[PDB]
């Protein structure tokens, strides 16, 4: 086998008619402004003390629970809080990119930044997210989102540093009006990153200054607290799916997410390494101050995470004060398969056995014969749901990755209120809006 490609096959590097033949409207060149010289020369670091795989080996997505030891910090949290994790790029991707830029041998040189004297960019300032005088290695590992999908203006600037006629023409197409569909297909939908682009266009030799003008900040990733300090003193738990997605990489089929791919590598020997975290300033996804108030928790898949924290917190509260007036706690949980991704099955049973969790309703979306999704079970218990919210001052909490799930749960609630109270659909919609304004309908949506 040699690789043989047919005349009709378009791809990142190759267009077909009409684009391959079109006259192009190409964006203006962004004005360069950074001068780079390579000079030869409230965050908490916490250990990972435990990690557990929550899903079976054949689950479509792998879910881990990670425990951090916060005992030697002054960090505190309440169930439902989020915190940020400061994660690096993969060493192999950083090395591959520096090698591609002819800079691997300069990786320990310090990056010194100034504004070019001759720049035509008004208001030019130095990128806040690149710390002055750090090593090239450090900046690519910890400061730049090298995974970012290159914008059309970045592709435009790369045109000028590409010497091969066909390659140059292709980048012109990809950043042009006419090329919008090829861009959306081959760059945006494909999740192409700078490295993928440079490997696919080998004659493109951009300067380091250009990259530093366009690569964005490597953002920390937030995670939800999935424990109570009352239950696991000195510890903080969180729960995540390892993100896997298809990418432009030629010698690689699946890429992992930056933060979850890193966490998964770190914990392989725990399943101690240390990670840096910081708290979010504002958190609002909390249990009611008044423990008598009943609550409804809706958390499909890893959306269950904050509610494990809520239940551990209430178990401890109840132990402190038996005979206390404690509101009901309902959980609507959803997963794909009872035998693969039923997160926390045993712990939930413990909560029910001990009367902390009042009701549990679980849906299995891909099991054979029932409720497929959480909103189906919510509708089956519409009478109780409406009463808790409208007569008992209850709160309802919706957590999870999909905005689709949140809208579907919202629309179920509209139906339930309309049906149970006998009001118009519009009045039910306004009811839920007012519950959100009153902070009794809370959402923690992750994407």
Q: Count how many Cα atoms sit within 13 Å of the Cα of residue 268 in the half-sphere of its side chain.
A: 6
61 annotated ligand binder:
yes
Under 8 Å between Cβ of 272 and 47: yes
Q: Which of 280, 312, 332 is the last residue of a domain?
A: 280
Give this entry's resolution in angstroms: 1.9
**Do 399 and 427 share a domain, yes or no?**
yes
259 annotated ligand binder:
yes
> Does residue 286 form part of some domain?
no
**Cα gap 263→239, rounded to integer Å:** 11
- The DSSP string of 247-312 is -S-SS-SEEE-HHHHHHHHHGGGT---EEEEEE-S-------SSTTS-EEEE--GGGGHHHHHHHH
Helix axes 403-421, 382-391, angle to 10 degrees: 80
SS3 content of the chain, % helix, strand, coil (to 5): 35, 20, 45
**Cα gap 85→102, rounded to integer Å:** 31
> Does residue 417 form part of some domain?
yes
176 annotated ligand binder:
no
203 annotated ligand binder:
no
> Does residue 435 form part of some domain?
yes
| Spatial CB neighbours of 140, under 8 Å, sequence gap ≥ 6 | 89, 94, 97, 98, 146
**Do 268 and 402 share a domain, yes or no?**
no
Under 8 Å between Cβ of 378 and 278: no
366 annotated ligand binder:
yes
> Does residue 419 form part of some domain?
yes
- Helix H or strand E encompassing 114: strand 110-115
**Do 167 and 240 share a domain, yes or no?**
no
Which residue has tokens 């949980």? 333
Strand pairing category for 359-364 and 329-335: parallel
Q: Which of 171, 191, 219 is the last residue of a domain?
A: 219
Rounded to 5 degrees, φ, ψ at 43 are: -110, 150
46 annotated ligand binder:
no
205 annotated ligand binder:
no
CATH number of the domain enclosing 51: 2.40.30.10
128 annotated ligand binder:
no
What torsion do the CA atoms of 362, 367, 369, 371 make, to the nearest 10 degrees? 30
223 annotated ligand binder:
yes
**Do 147 and 179 share a domain, yes or no?**
yes
Rounded to 5 degrees, φ, ψ at 184 are: -65, -40
Q: Could you count the other beta carbons within 10 Å of the beta carbon of residue 196?
A: 22
260 annotated ligand binder:
yes
- Helix H or strand E encompassing 421: helix 403-421
**Cα gap 63→343, rounded to integer Å:** 8
How many structural domains is the chain composed of? 3
**Do 231 and 211 share a domain, yes or no?**
no
Q: What is the DSSP letter of 105?
A: G
- The DSSP string of 74-112 is -----TT-EEEEE-PPPHHHHHHHHHHTT-GGGTTSEEE
| Spatial CB neighbours of 394, under 8 Å, sequence gap ≥ 6 | 293, 294, 295, 296, 327, 388, 440
**Cα gap 227→49, rounded to integer Å:** 14
Which structural domain, as residue segments, surrounds residue 343?
293-447
23 annotated ligand binder:
no
Q: Could you count the other beta carbons within 10 Å of the beta carbon of residue 394?
A: 22
Q: Could you count the other beta carbons within 10 Å of the beta carbon of residue 29?
A: 12
Under 8 Å between Cβ of 209 and 28: no
Q: Three-state DSSP class for 111? A: strand
11 annotated ligand binder:
no
Query: What token pair was written down for 182?
Result: 């090829």
**Do 234 and 203 share a domain, yes or no?**
no
Nearest of 381, 438, 437, 391 to residue 413 by alpha carbon: 381
160 annotated ligand binder:
no
């Amino acid at each position: 086998s040699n690789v043989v490609i047919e005349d009709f096959e378009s791809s990142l590097t190759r267009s077909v008619p009409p684009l391959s033949q079109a006259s192009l409207n190409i964006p203006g060149l962004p004005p360069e402004y950074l001068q780079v010289h390579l000079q030869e020369s409230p965050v908490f670091q916490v250990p990972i003390s435990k990690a557990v795989q929550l899903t079976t080996n054949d689950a479509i997505k792998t879910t881990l629970l990670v425990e951090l030891d916060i005992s030697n910090t002054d960090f505190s949290y309440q169930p439902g809080d989020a915190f940020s994790v400061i994660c690096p790029n993969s060493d192999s991707e950083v090395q591959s990119l520096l090698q591609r830029l002819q800079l691997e041998d300069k990786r320990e040189h310090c990056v010194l930044l100034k504004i070019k004297a001759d720049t035509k960019k008004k208001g030019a300032t130095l990128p806040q997210h690149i710390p002055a005088g750090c090593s090239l290695q450090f900046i690519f590992t910890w400061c730049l989102e090298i995974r970012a999908i290159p914008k059309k203006a970045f592709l435009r600037a790369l045109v000028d540093y590409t010497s091969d006629s066909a390659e140059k023409r292709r980048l012109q197409e990809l950043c042009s009006k006419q090329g919008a569909a090829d861009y959306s297909r081959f760059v945006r939908d494909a999740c192409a990153c700078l490295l993928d682009l440079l490997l696919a266009f080998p004659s493109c030799q951009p300067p380091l200054s250009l990259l530093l003008e366009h690569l964005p900040k490597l953002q920390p990733r937030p995670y939800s607290c999935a424990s109570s300090s009352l239950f696991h003193p000195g510890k903080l738990h969180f729960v995540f799916n390892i993100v896997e997605f298809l990418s432009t990489a030629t010698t690689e089929v699946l890429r992992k997410g930056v933060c979850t791919g890193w966490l998964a590598l770190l914990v392989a020997s725990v399943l101690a390494p240390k990670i840096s975290i910081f708290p979010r300033t504002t958190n609002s996804f909390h249990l009611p101050d008044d423990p008598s108030i009943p609550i409804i928790m809706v958390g499909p898949g890893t959306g269950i995470a904050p509610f494990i924290g809520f239940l551990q917190h209430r178990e401890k509260l109840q132990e402190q004060h038996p005979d206390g007036n404690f509101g009901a706690m309902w959980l609507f949980f959803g997963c794909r398969h009872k035998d693969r991704d039923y997160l926390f099955r045993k712990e939930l049973r413990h909560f029910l056995k001990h009367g902390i969790l009042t009701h549990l309703k679980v849906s299995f979306s891909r099991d054979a014969p029932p409720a497929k999704y959480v909103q189906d079970n919510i509708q089956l218990h519409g009478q109780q749901v409406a009463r808790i919210l409208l007569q008992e001052n209850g709160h309802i909490y919706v957590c999870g990755d999909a905005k689709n799930m949140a809208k579907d749960v919202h629309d179920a609630l509209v139906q339930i209120i309309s049906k149970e109270v006998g009001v118009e659909k519009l009045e039910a919609m306004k009811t839920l809006a007012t519950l959100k304004e009153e902070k009794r309908y809370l959402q923690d949506i992750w994407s």
